[PDB]
């Protein structure tokens, strides 16, 4: 079926200090897609959990849930100068055939760009 990964890369600008409330919001947006199924993606409201982190979110694209999630990120990312968010889209069939080493890094390099805020 239409399985895709939304490769999300979150980094800190330095253009502006990041609030603790802004961190708690982003971590909350991410954890809405986190369960026992993919606990490794879990985010905390700390700098180590959000700065320079790649997160590959699995979606069935025939569902609108991927669009919802990306919209929540884009909406957030535009009301927060301190955090940059980049998003790519990649086939799951291409994702699993990538190496495991630096996989999310290579997915962003070979994935289709969605936005860079």
């Amino acid at each position: 079926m239409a399985f895709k990964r939304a490769i999300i890369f979150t980094s800190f600008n330095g253009f502006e200090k990041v609030s603790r409330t802004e961190k708690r919001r982003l971590a909350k947006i991410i954890n809405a897609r986190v369960s026992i199924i993919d606990e490794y993606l879990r985010a905390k409201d700390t700098n180590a959990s959000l700065d320079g982190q790649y997160r590959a979110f699995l979606f069935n694209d025939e569902s609108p849930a991927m669009t919802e999630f990306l919209a929540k990120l884009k909406a957030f990312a535009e009301s927060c100068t301190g955090i940059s968010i980049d998003a790519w889209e990649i086939e799951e069939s291409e994702y699993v055939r990538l190496p495991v080493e630096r996989r999310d890094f290579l997915a962003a390099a070979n994935g289709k760009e969605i936005f860079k805020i």
Binding site: F3, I37, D38, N60, S63
Partner: protein
């Protein structure tokens, strides 16, 4: 004892309910055509898929996520065989293609992949385990060499 303990209890219980429902809605998002409700073993298959990077742990072949619930495509195997370990813990459960889980029998991964002579298949298997998202106690369990004996 107290009422504020009661409130914390339903606070904590809500987080438990919300997470189990989060995993349930995700499962039917991935598989709309999945008839019925995802059982624990179905969630485990999906969980194992993510931790093994979409690869069959024994063959290294890519698992088609679409056929995950297809009866007779992917199986949950006891790495260290249940007959010699009685280990039904999550640490001893791995995801493999049904085709590749036909000739292992009662062997450990170490025995099956001829790790005694450090074979290529052993090295590839070991590399697949150490690079997975398994806990480090799960990797150790899977990669066990000798037993009690």
């Amino acid at each position: 004892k107290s009422f504020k303990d009661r409130k914390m209890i339903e606070k904590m219980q809500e987080e438990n309910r919300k997470d189990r429902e989060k995993a349930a809605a995700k499962f039917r998002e991935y598989f709309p055509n999945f008839v019925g409700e995802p059982k624990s073993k179905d969630i485990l298959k999906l969980r194992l898929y993510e931790m093994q990077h979409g690869k069959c742990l024994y063959s290294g072949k890519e698992i088609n996520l679409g056929r995950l619930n297809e009866k007779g495509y992917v199986e949950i195997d006891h790495a260290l065989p249940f007959s010699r370990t009685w280990d039904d813990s999550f640490n001893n459960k791995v995801l493999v293609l049904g085709s590749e889980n036909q000739n292992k029998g009662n062997q450990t991964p170490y025995e099956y992949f001829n790790g005694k002579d450090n074979s290529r298949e052993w090295q590839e298997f070991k590399a697949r385990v150490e690079t997975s998202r398994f806990p480090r106690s799960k990797k150790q369990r899977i990669l066990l060499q000798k037993f009690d004996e």
